[PDB]
Design a protein around this ligand. Structure first.
Ligand SMILES: [Zn+2]
Ligand SMILES: [Zn+2]
Lengths: 195, 144, 37, 114, 130, 49, 177, 49
């Protein structure tokens, strides 16, 4: 379906071009297969992010990565890649509004689910390759807020920093007040506990 | 035997209150930290403007890295000395370090004032991402 | 108190002045740049 | 040095000398087609290789969200405030920490260094 | 540091700036005017080209900063090259006072003819010790 | 030798089920591309570098 | 306010005010003692300096404070530095001798050259002394005095490395026996 | 046709696509030789599955 979308749009196939224009265009890869080139990559990236946030043609595990310095767009829909959710930020503002949280509070007897937040394009899955092309915000309450700006272009914001922890390391109270070898020791030992 | 049986009468501990310094001490530590941050910013903008000149037998990156390294080192040492000055006579950390039975002055400076610079291979944290240590920072940043 | 002062015993002619005056000029124009801020 | 292919079979033209006229002739091989060469120099390589990074700068980097943006260096073609500044950070490098600036205005990719 | 300079292994690659195989079949009128001025000063003495000289020019320009750093003069480098290659390389050097430190190499009068100069420069860049 | 170093560094490819490597232009010739300009057009997307 | 601010990075900005205030001699003495306590502290050197230019201004203005600045500089010339690289220490001492030459330009030649001859014959590297005499021979011009050659000539035979040098040898040999 | 670049294809006319892919591979090899693009890291987790 991604290739169908590209054929619908102005994606120039390799066999259908002279080589000379390749330097004046951006290469397009699909799971490591060069399919062709494109002239205005920014428009294509905007459209692809729009469609993934709308889940029209693209399921929300396909990662799109635009390397400007090499003029390349790599798209991966294969298995084995690892991603995590991240909130989307535009105009230095969260797309997550209080009405979304209100809909979340009534989850039972409402049938509003996480998949609606995925469907509304407020939270999107990002993989480690695409993370390279992200200016991420730790916390929205200070970093996106106006200040003597460290950065003024934040695309994504983390839901909560504590989710970097592991399943058996998350049980540590105040893990950021301990020498990290002690955190590894506790992670090892908690699996050995009795209960 | 005799020292333990006396220690029952005396007793020894370690508490949160043993890890507290004066508000003046924290303020002085924070002033030193902001001073070091501003100095590192000065060195960064000097290197950016091609105003930092390399030392003999060292490239510009080596000169900049050594300068910022020693800035953080003496800032950490000054904060540690200030923390050591703030300790009481009843501070159990000082009891355990002066006796030498456990810990060190570096450990007290770590717990109370500044954990300090982390290192891999003897250098600061490398750019695992392209020109970035983590996504939360901007590209081509060399701050502490 | 001590009356007039004896000028320094001149031992030579300065065909060129030391570079500290050049450093003075550079530091002065940098001070002007700061005052511009 | 100007690199040129054969006009008959598109293989590399190799320089050669004619002892009669004493002029460089870009002669092909496996096709015996000859051409008048004029550079008087077959090969140059700068071992200094202090190349201008502005050749390798690409104006599209104005679109990146991760690069730091300065508002204190107006452009020279349009005077646009916001400019994206960064370090080239290639090989033949890691001794020049200079900042290369790209004008952030659309369709004005004026690039410079300071 | 002077003694230190006499210990660190120096080669042509470390001190050279760039190289160019200019064609120049006529030694009198060289293809580069910049070459031609001091060449008229130097080929004013027609020496080792009166019999014949190669029709290939190898013009190498060297960094002044490394030469001042390593205390070298162009004359001793020319003597080292001559010791390395005998008559095989006629080396004609510009006076060591110009902006660029230039040196021309041609082949012996008794003499590949063009790729052999690539062999010469590739061998001389690293293997030669100054 | 004195001539391989003269020309300079070369590029090879060690193919699967082929113990010995081969040069790249040989592989491009094997894919039916004889024009070296066409071969570089697959590699060097400009010709002003 | 400037010396007690200590946040100070504004020193480059306050330089004109610093010099006009230094025109008062007591202010110059205060700046001298402040610079002494500042630079004399350990680990002061993490900068590509400026306080030494303040000492240059102090020596330029008031001749009476000439013995004081030298008494500081020689102290800074004999202090040993550990965390500074040896080449960095050498360049630091070269800067200190540049300040010594600036002081010498103001007519305080004899005690400075006497200390130089002392620390030669009594330690320091010959390179720094060669650099100092090169700087002195840069700006010097004839004519001279008997005591000046008495202090400056006998140091001038222990080395033979470099033409103002041979010019001075000819002048002093002909005129100043 | 088969054992080299299977993911590109095995058809008769994807030989041109395979040629372009090989040209891109050696192009990036050239860029690493000139350092126009940096070297890749085996431990960069984006190269993992
Ligand atoms: Zn041809
Ligand atoms: Zn502009």
């Amino acid at each position: 379906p991604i290739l169908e979308f590209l054929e619908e749009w102005s994606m120039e196939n390799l066999e259908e071009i002279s080589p000379a224009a390749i330097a004046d265009a951006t290469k397009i890869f699909v799971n490591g297969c060069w399919v062709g080139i494109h002239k205005d990559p920014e428009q294509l990236m905007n459209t692809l992010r729009k469609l993934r946030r709308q889940m029209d043609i693209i399921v929300s595990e396909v990662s799109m990565i635009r390397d400007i310095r090499e003029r390349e767009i790599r798209i991966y829909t294969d298995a084995g890649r690892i991603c995590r959710p991240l909130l989307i930020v535009e105009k230095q503002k969260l797309l997550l509004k209080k009405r979304h949280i209100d809909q979340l509070k009534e989850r039972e007897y409402n049938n509003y689910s996480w998949q609606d937040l995925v469907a509304s394009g407020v939270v999107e899955y990002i993989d480690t390759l695409e993370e390279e092309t992200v200016m991420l915000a730790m916390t929205p309450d200070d970093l996106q807020e106006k200040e003597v700006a460290y950065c003024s272009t934040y695309t994504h914001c983390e839901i909560h920093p504590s989710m970097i922890l592991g399943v058996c390391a998350s049980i540590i109270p105040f893990p950021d007040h301990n020498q990290s070898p002690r955190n590894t020791y506790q992670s090892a030992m908690g699996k050995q506990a009795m209960g | 035997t005799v020292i333990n049986n006396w220690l029952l009468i005396e007793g020894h501990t370690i508490g949160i209150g043993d890890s507290i310094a004066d508000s003046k001490t924290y303020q002085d530590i924070q002033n030193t930290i902001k001073k070091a941050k501003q100095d590192v910013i000065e060195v960064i903008e000097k290197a950016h403007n091609n105003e930092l000149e390399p030392t003999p037998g060292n490239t510009l990156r080596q000169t900049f890295e050594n300068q910022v390294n020693r800035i953080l080192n003496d800032a950490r040492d000054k904060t540690g000395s200030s923390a050591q000055k703030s300790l009481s006579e009843y501070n159990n950390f000082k009891s355990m370090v002066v006796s030498g039975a456990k810990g060190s002055k570096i450990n007290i400076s770590q717990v109370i004032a500044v954990v300090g610079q982390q290192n891999v291979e003897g250098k600061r944290i490398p750019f695992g991402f392209k020109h970035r240590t983590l996504p939360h920072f901007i590209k081509d940043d060399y701050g502490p | 108190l001590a009356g007039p002062l004896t000028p320094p015993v001149k031992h030579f002619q300065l065909k060129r002045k030391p570079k500290s005056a050049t450093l003075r000029a550079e530091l002065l124009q940098k001070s002007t740049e700061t005052a511009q801020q | 040095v100007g690199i040129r292919f054969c006009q008959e079979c598109n293989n590399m033209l190799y320089p050669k000398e004619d002892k009669e006229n004493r002029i460089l002739l870009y002669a092909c091989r496996n096709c015996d087609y000859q051409q008048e060469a004029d550079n008087s120099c077959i090969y140059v390589n700068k071992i200094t290789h202090e190349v201008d990074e502005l050749t390798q700068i690409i104006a599209d980097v104005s679109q990146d969200p991760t690069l730091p943006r300065t508002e204190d260096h107006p452009c020279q073609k349009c005077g646009h405030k916001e400019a994206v500044f960064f370090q080239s950070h290639s090989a033949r490098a890691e001794d020049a920490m200079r900042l290369y600036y790209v004008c952030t205005a659309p369709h004005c990719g004026h690039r410079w260094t300071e | 540091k002077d003694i230190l300079c006499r210990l660190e292994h120096t080669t042509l690659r470390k001190v050279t700036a760039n190289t160019a195989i200019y064609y120049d079949p006529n030694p009198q009128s060289t293809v580069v005017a910049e070459d031609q001025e001091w060449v008229n000063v130097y080929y004013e003495m027609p020496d080792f080209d009166v019999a014949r000289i190669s029709p290939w020019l190898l013009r190498v320009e060297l960094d002044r900063k490394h030469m001042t750093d390593r205390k070298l003069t162009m004359e001793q480098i020319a003597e080292k090259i001559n010791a390395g290659f005998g008559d095989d390389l006629n080396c004609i050097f510009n006076d060591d006072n110009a902006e660029k430190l230039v040196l021309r190499i041609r082949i012996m009068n008794s003499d590949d003819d063009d790729v052999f100069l690539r062999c010469i420069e590739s061998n001389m860049l690293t293997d030669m010790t100054l | 030798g004195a001539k391989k170093s003269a020309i300079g560094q070369r590029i090879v490819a060690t193919l699967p089920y082929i113990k010995q490597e081969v040069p790249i232009i040989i592989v491009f010739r094997a894919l039916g591309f004889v024009s070296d300009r066409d071969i570089l057009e697959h590699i060097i997307y400009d010709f002003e570098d | 306010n400037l010396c007690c601010n200590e946040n100070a990075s504004e020193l480059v900005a306050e330089l004109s005010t610093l010099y006009q205030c230094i025109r008062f001699p007591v202010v110059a003495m205060g700046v001298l003692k402040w610079v002494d306590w500042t630079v004399s502290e350990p680990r002061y050197f993490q900068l590509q300096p400026v306080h030494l230019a303040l000492l240059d201004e102090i020596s330029t203005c008031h001749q009476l404070l000439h013995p004081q600045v030298l008494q500081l500089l020689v102290k800074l010339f004999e202090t040993e530095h550990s965390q500074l690289d040896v080449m960095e220490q050498l360049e630091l001492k070269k800067t200190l001798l540049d300040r010594m030459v600036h002081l010498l330009s103001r007519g305080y030649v004899l005690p400075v050259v006497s200390y130089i001859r002392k620390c030669l014959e009594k330690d320091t590297d010959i390179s720094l002394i060669r650099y100092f005499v090169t700087e002195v021979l840069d700006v010097i011009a004839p004519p001279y005095t008997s005591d000046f050659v008495q202090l400056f000539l006998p140091i001038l035979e222990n080395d033979s490395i470099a033409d103002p040098v041979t010019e001075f040898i000819a002048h002093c040999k002909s005129n100043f026996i | 046709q088969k054992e080299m670049l299977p993911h590109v294809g095995v058809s008769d006319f994807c030989e041109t696509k395979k040629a372009y892919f090989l040209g891109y591979m050696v192009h990036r090899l050239l860029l690493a030789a000139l350092g126009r693009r940096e070297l890749d890291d085996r431990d960069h987790y984006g190269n993992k599955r």
